[PDB]
């Protein structure tokens, strides 16, 4: 039960607005209706350590809000720097966000995500991604399209925040109340 | 009183900006962009750094004083400055300069502008760039604290400078100062300056190299704090012009092989990584004395952390083999159009390195001990063998897993470079590792697997029962049970064990098979896909050998089970169909009792995808975009049936419309589809030409059009297809030579062209010439050289055989077209181990032809100067 400042930077179109939409929706959504006023979507995951309030600041990449650059990065607690493996640029027009982010938030945890890996025409080969290895972040091939690793950024962020490597999300449904669960089964006749 | 009731309006817009939400979003975005018109207040309602902070909020003010402010750079970047050039408005804030401490956070929330408003006004490099020195050595403790006000800007120079002889001889006497601010006790004041006094290029590469003092003034500059000694251990092993390192170098390696050891993990990575960056040779003259000076520490890193161990153990505990695999764990997979190629004996790296899709994430030290150890078989070899045994002798039982694992790892970690020399102990280790697999060390069996296979090549190139029988026995027990992690490491391994033993596994089929067949009943989605791949591999290896009632009868049922279960849209079809595509070719005719529907499914998928495309092209709104990969996979499987059933597929084709679907596919706007169809036309041409022939007058020119090297892979298969077509129709090919011959002779001589394309081109030219000697023969001197150079390295087989029949035939029609390059042909001829007597006698003639050209003694002498093997083969072909 805790709110968090997660800025979702990254070039325009890369997926940010659909990616988030995914954890809120139940399916994809194609179109590209560019984000203007950096929207604030709230997300909540259920972990083995309790719930987690993640306030996702769906930033913009276009000059729709290309005016208000930082300002949200202010008192930010964590960031997701997202690009596009199917775009030669993006991964290039990236280190400009790591900076115009580390400027404000000075040591928040940041996850770099190569999105859209669900496409055969992969422009930015993985082998071309060394940034994270250097400016020391965390990388994740992902696809807001299909859901490939569409949770990893958050789990890694939560784990970095709460400071618990044992933390994990409990997708697993509920069963008998843990405190009434009967003898192993063999302990029955033991 | 005037703009005072207005400024208390920003104290309100910040109570929405800061705490923004959906409404405030699309709503406040109006008030924020309507206050950019009455600009008689923003030029004032900005100074609000020690005005708004020092007013009400703190986090909120900083979100405008540091916040909105920065949004004006955009008004100066995008303007060229003719808006607000004003120097008071400029010095009004260029005065906030001497305000470096109002809550260290806000002590920088404005200092980044000092980089922006200088990039959009670079000229005038001194009214503002005066703080440079007018605060330079000022940090020498002169404010709130001492540096806690002066230092809270010294760093804002690293950012403004690095992040932004005209003025090349002015700055030297300033950046030399930075070496000073180093022994300061302050953290920032030490590092903040330091790592920054190392961002070097050419803009003023002076004071730099001359400093051999900033080497030892740092070669001892240990952790002035912590988060610095790291960015320091970041620069020494960060250079190219190592002319000055050459000197103080046998110490840097000593005051490093331990700075990579410093308990703070984050440091060691910036060290170890940046350290073992063994570029050119000179970087190993030193590693010589460094044999023992590092193969103990790295080795003792090759073990997992207590946490990378936590994050793992997760799905480690052998008891997940019954846990469904999440859909978010299924990395996207595609289908690559088959490329018709040749074989070169027991001779991968240019295919497997195109898939480094994991390692790129988990970059701890472990993925750097061995990851940097990626030189001790690239720079040198077997140099490490000595002394490492005892390490890995105890390691292989010492303590619990963590270490044993680090051993079983290193072992396989070296075999690809320190092999031969390792081979000696190899006959004792291997039968041991085979034990590890049988433990309860879940995450250890994993590397036991990957390691065994890491160098199983040997285990195969050995006697059976000794260990290629037990290995393949325990490796298989792992294929099952265990945890899913084991299962993968298991299969992937065995998968390689196959590709190796190729045909040597044949004895223990029934066995291998029942292991695999059982997996289908225990495996989860993620692993099932590897299971499929396993089988297809096994089939490619064993060959027709797999064609036997007992085998077939137990392998199909499970596959059919899947086949009837997948929608025509399920991506698993790729692995499944790719598997079949193989199996079908191995069962040769023995797959018949299964082909009708396999065939049908393919044809229908091609028929559906072709349609789905047009409909989507015209009505994107209604029909979705088809994934052409299903065509390619289906096309490729039909191409596989035709190869295996070859001939028996006659009937099927006749009652279908593949031939019509061909015109559609060879004409597709996507290369891979085009590429796959040609591979098919070729195989079909071998199986039932009777059904193709009528369309040759249509197809031929299409292929001609596709001999465009703009897409080699397409070109490659179109080439091979022309070769198989010309053989099926002898001289009746004569008329199509002009629209193909030129492009072929062009390609064979095209620079930077991939081997496979040159091999097929060579082969096809051979064939065309075998059919129309008179037509191709006159052009023999234009390709005979690349022809030999290329084909001399291909395995004897049907294709190589026809190709040589053609050259031999042409050579006779035009001997003078090869005499000059007679040594090239000889080598090509001698690449033959056992050729058909028919062809063997054509060689004999051409050879005796050469003898006649240089004379008995020259030919005697020439013939003798060959390395033994060739020498004899040539002798055998010649008949004195
Ligand atoms: N195939 C595929 N399409 C994707 C994926 N992610 C996003 N897209 C598509 O790419 C387009 C742009 O995505 P969108 O979410 O609008 O990008 P954005 O980065 O949020 N836009 P903005 O920078 O303006 O804020 C949309 O049509 C979207 O569906 C993906 O993983 N796979
Ligand atoms: Mg958007």
């Amino acid at each position: 039960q805790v709110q968090f400042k997660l800025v979702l930077v990254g070039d325009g179109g890369t997926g940010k607005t659909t990616f988030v939409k995914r954890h809120l929706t139940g399916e994809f959504e194609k179109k590209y209706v560019a984000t203007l006023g950096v929207e604030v979507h709230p997300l909540v995951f259920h972990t083995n350590r309790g719930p987690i309030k993640f306030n996702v600041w769906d930033t913009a990449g276009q000059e729709k809000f290309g005016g208000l650059r930082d300002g949200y990065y202010i008192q930010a607690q964590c960031a997701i720097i997202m690009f596009d493996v199917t775009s030669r640029v993006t991964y290039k027009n990236v280190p400009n966000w790591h900076r115009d982010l580390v400027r404000v938030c000075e040591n928040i945890p940041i996850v770099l995500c190569g999105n859209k890996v669900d496409i055969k025409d992969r422009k930015v080969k993985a082998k071309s991604i060394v940034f994270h290895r250097k400016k020391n972040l965390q990388y994740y091939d992902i696809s807001a399209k299909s859901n490939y690793n569409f949770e990893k950024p958050f789990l890694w962020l939560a784990r970095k925040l709460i400071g618990d490597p044992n933390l994990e999300f409990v997708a697993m449904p509920a069963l008998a109340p843990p405190e009434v669960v009967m003898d192993p089964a063999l302990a029955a006749q033991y | 009183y005037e703009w005072k009731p207005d400024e208390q309006g920003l104290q309100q817009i910040l109570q929405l900006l800061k705490e923004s939400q959906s409404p405030d979003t699309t709503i406040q975005r109006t008030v924020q962009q309507k206050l950019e018109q009455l600009n008689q207040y923003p030029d004032f309602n900005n100074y609000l750094i020690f005005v708004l902070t020092k007013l009400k909020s703190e986090d909120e003010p900083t979100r405008s004083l540091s916040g909105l402010i920065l949004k004006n750079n955009v008004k100066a970047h995008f303007q060229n400055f003719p808006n607000g050039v004003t120097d008071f408005i400029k010095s009004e804030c260029l005065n906030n300069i001497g305000d470096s401490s109002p809550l260290i956070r806000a002590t920088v929330g404005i200092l980044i502008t000092t980089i922006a408003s200088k990039g959009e006004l670079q000229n005038w490099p001194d009214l503002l760039p005066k703080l440079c020195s007018l605060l330079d050595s000022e940090d020498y403790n002169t404010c709130e604290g001492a540096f806690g006000a002066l230092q809270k800007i010294c760093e804002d120079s690293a950012e403004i400078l690095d992040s932004d002889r005209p003025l090349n001889i002015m700055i030297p006497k300033f950046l030399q100062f930075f070496k000073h601010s180093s022994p300061k006790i302050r953290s920032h004041a030490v590092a903040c300056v330091n790592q920054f006094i190392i961002s070097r290029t050419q803009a003023l590469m002076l004071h730099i190299d001359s400093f051999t003092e900033n080497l030892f003034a740092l070669a001892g500059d240990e952790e002035p704090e912590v988060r610095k000694n790291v960015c320091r251990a970041l620069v020494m092993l960060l250079e190219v012009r190592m002319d000055r390192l050459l000197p103080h170098m046998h110490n840097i390696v000593e005051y490093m092989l331990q700075r990579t050891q410093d308990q703070d993990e984050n440091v060691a990575l910036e060290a170890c990584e940046f350290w073992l960056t063994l570029a050119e040779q000179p970087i190993c003259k030193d590693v010589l004395v460094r044999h023992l000076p590092k193969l103990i520490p790295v080795l003792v890193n090759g073990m997992k952390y207590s946490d990378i161990d936590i994050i793992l153990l997760k799905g480690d505990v052998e008891e997940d083999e019954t846990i469904p695999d999440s859909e978010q764990d299924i990395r996207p997979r595609f289908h690559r159009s088959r490329t018709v190629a040749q074989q070169h004996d027991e001779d991968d790296d240019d295919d497997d390195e195109i898939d480094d899709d994991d390692t790129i994430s988990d970059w701890n030290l472990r993925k750097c001990s061995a990851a940097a150890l990626d030189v001790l078989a690239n720079v040198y070899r077997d140099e490490l063998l000595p002394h490492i045994l005892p390490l890995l002798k105890e390691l292989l039982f010492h303590h619990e897993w963590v270490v044993k694992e680090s051993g079983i790892l290193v072992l396989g970690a070296i075999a690809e470079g320190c092999m031969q020399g390792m081979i000696p102990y190899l006959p004792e280790l291997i039968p041991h590792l085979i034990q590890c697999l049988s433990d309860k060390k879940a995450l250890v069996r994993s590397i036991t697997c990957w390691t065994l296979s890491r160098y199983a090549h040997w285990v195969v190139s050995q006697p059976p029962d000794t260990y290629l029988k037990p290995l393949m026995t325990e490796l298989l027990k792992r294929i099952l049970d265990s945890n899913k992690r084991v299962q993968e490491a298991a299969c992937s391994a065995f998968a390689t064990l196959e590709e190796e033993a190729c045909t040597e596994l044949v004895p223990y089929l029934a066995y291998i098979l029942d292991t695999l067949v059982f997996a289908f009943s225990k495996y989860q989605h993620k692993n099932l896909l590897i299971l499929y791949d396993a089988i297809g591999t096994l089939a490619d290896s064993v060959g027709h050998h797999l064609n036997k009632p007992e085998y077939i009868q137990m392998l199909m049922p499970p596959l059919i089970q899947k086949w009837n279960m997948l929608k025509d849209e399920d991506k698993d079809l790729f692995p499944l169909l790719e598997c079949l595509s193989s199996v079908a070719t191995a069962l040769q005719s023995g797959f018949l009792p299964y082909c009708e529907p396999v065939y049908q499914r393919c044809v229908n998928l091609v028929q559906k995808t072709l349609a789905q495309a047009m409909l989507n092209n015209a009505q994107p709104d209604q029909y979705e975009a088809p994934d052409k990969d299903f065509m390619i996979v289906a096309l490729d499987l039909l191409s596989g049936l035709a190869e295996g059933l070859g001939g028996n597929i006659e009937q099927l084709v006749a009652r279908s419309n593949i031939l019509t679907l061909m015109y559609q596919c060879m004409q597709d706007k996507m290369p891979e589809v085009r590429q796959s169809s040609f591979a098919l036309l070729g195989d079909l041409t071998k199986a039932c030409f009777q059904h193709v022939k009528p369309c040759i007058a249509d197809f031929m020119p299409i292929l001609g059009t596709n001999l465009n090297p703009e897409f080699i892979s397409v070109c490659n298969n179109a080439t091979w297809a022309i070769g198989e077509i010309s053989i099926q129709m002898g001289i009746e090919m004569q008329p199509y030579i002009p629209m193909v011959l030129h492009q072929l002779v062009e390609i064979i001589n095209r620079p930077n062209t991939p081997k496979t394309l040159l091999e097929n081109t060579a082969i096809t030219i051979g064939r065309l010439g075998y059919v129309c000697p008179q037509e191709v023969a006159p052009m023999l001197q234009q390709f005979i050289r690349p022809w030999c150079t290329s084909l001399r390295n291909i395995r004897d087989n049907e294709e190589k055989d026809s190709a040589f029949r053609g050259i031999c035939t042409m050579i006779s029609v035009n001997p003078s077209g090869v005499i000059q390059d007679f040594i090239f042909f000889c080598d090509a001829v001698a690449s033959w181990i056992n050729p058909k007597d028919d062809l063997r006698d054509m060689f004999c003639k051409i050879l005796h032809g050469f003898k006649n050209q240089v004379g008995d003694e020259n030919w005697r002498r020439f013939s003798d100067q060959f390395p033994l093997p060739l020498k004899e083969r040539l002798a055998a072909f010649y008949g004195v």
Side-chain angles (χ1 to χ4, degrees), chain A residues 26-133:
Chain A
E27 85 299 289
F28 188 54
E29 189 66 63
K30 173 196 172 185
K31 75 295 181 293
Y32 194 146
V33 188
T35 296
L36 304 153
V38 171
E39 179 42 50
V40 186
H41 301 278
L43 281 164
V44 167
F45 298 79
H46 301 297
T47 86
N48 54 193
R49 194 80 127 62
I52 278 180
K53 312 291 170 175
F54 248 124
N55 286 313
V56 188
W57 271 1
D58 200 326
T59 217
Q62 286 302 61
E63 291 321 314
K64 299 299 153 300
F65 208 179
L68 214 187
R69 46 164 168 174
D70 317 310
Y72 329 71
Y73 304 21
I74 304 296
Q75 45 79 61
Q77 300 170 293
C78 52
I80 283 178
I81 306 181
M82 183 178 286
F83 57 108
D84 185 313
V85 259
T86 80
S87 183
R88 299 306 299 88
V89 55
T90 46
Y91 181 70
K92 291 152 67 185
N93 183 49
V94 146
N96 281 176
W97 308 79
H98 181 199
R99 69 140 43 71
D100 199 49
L101 182 90
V102 170
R103 288 316 197 207
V104 194
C105 294
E106 197 172 307
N107 69 256
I108 56 167
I110 338 177
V111 166
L112 181 63
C113 295
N115 187 49
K116 290 186 176 173
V117 297
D118 75 293
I119 288 176
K120 210 145 102 86
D121 222 334
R122 184 160 177 175
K123 301 307 176 184
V124 178
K125 198 291 185 176
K127 189 176 299 190
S128 310
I129 309 178
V130 187
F131 192 44
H132 68 288
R133 182 86 166 195

Side-chain angles (χ1 to χ4, degrees), chain B residues 370-653:
Chain B
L373 199 166
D374 242 309
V375 73
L376 313 171
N378 202 58
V379 78
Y380 218 79
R381 298 154 152 294
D382 309 66
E383 44 173 353
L384 327 172
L385 309 184
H387 111 299
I388 301 183
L389 167 65
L391 306 176
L392 176 49
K393 185 64 182 183
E394 181 187 354
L395 280 169
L396 295 191
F397 191 46
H398 157 293
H399 184 267
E400 287 194 309
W401 72 50
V402 198
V403 266
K404 183 155 189 171
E405 179 286 315
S406 63
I408 304 183
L409 179 160
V410 301
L411 194 48
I414 37 171
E416 185 176 301
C418 309
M419 184 64 265
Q420 329 89 308
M422 219 300 266
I423 302 181
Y425 323 68
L426 199 46
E428 271 294 356
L429 284 166
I430 299 179
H432 171 51
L433 296 173
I434 295 188
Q435 249 302 65
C436 307
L437 308 173
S438 313
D439 190 66
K440 57 248 191 69
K441 51 188 65 172
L443 192 56
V444 189
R445 302 177 255 168
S446 298
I447 1 75
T448 306
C449 283
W450 171 88
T451 297
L452 284 168
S453 64
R454 185 55 182 182
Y455 50 51
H457 163 307
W458 194 79
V459 189
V460 158
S461 311
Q462 294 294 312
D465 298 51
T466 316
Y467 29 58
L468 170 49
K469 185 163 183 171
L471 173 55
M472 181 195 288
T473 299
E474 286 304 295
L475 206 51
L476 285 173
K477 292 163 67 180
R478 298 270 62 65
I479 286 303
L480 305 197
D481 192 88
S482 275
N483 75 335
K484 304 189 289 194
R485 198 203 190 66
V486 155
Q487 307 188 323
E488 185 184 21
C491 288
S492 330
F494 181 119
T496 309
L497 191 54
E498 297 181 309
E499 304 156 330
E500 230 301 340
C502 181
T503 42
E504 208 84 69
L505 313 78
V506 178
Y508 324 79
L509 235 53
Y511 196 48
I512 293 181
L513 238 61
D514 211 15
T515 292
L516 305 179
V517 189
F518 187 65
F520 282 113
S521 180
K522 170 151 71 183
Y523 272 34
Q524 224 61 298
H525 186 157
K526 213 163 179 180
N527 280 171
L528 160 52
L529 295 207
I530 290 187
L531 177 52
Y532 286 136
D533 291 43
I535 299 173
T537 271
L538 157 60
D540 295 314
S541 306
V542 173
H544 313 301
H545 284 288
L546 183 62
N547 187 10
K548 298 217 181 66
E550 159 159 281
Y551 305 139
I552 285 177
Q553 196 187 314
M554 64 186 258
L555 171 57
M556 295 311 276
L559 292 170
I560 302 187
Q561 208 286 127
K562 295 298 170 183
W563 175 283
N564 298 327
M565 181 184 266
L566 304 168
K567 289 184 285 66
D568 249 5
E569 316 136 52
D570 210 296
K571 309 262 186 167
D572 296 337
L573 274 196
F574 300 147
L576 182 55
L577 292 199
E578 281 177 284
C579 177
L580 275 194
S581 170
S582 278
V583 181
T585 299
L587 261 41
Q588 284 207 313
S589 122
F591 180 76
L592 276 171
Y594 305 100
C595 66
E596 283 235 69
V598 162
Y599 183 94
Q600 193 59 248
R601 191 163 195 173
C602 290
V603 170
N604 290 191
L605 253 185
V606 174
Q607 246 164 169
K608 293 191 289 181
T609 308
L610 282 194
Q612 184 59 26
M614 286 183 252
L615 293 177
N616 165 274
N617 175 75
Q619 305 166 60
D621 35 300
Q622 317 293 281
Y623 302 94
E624 262 172 60
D627 165 309
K628 309 272 256 299
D629 259 28
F630 287 84
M631 259 189 264
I632 308 174
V633 92
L635 281 179
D636 285 341
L637 170 54
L638 283 164
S639 175
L641 289 180
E643 185 179 296
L645 295 174
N648 269 305
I649 204 178
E650 184 288 290
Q651 189 73 332
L652 229 33
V653 152

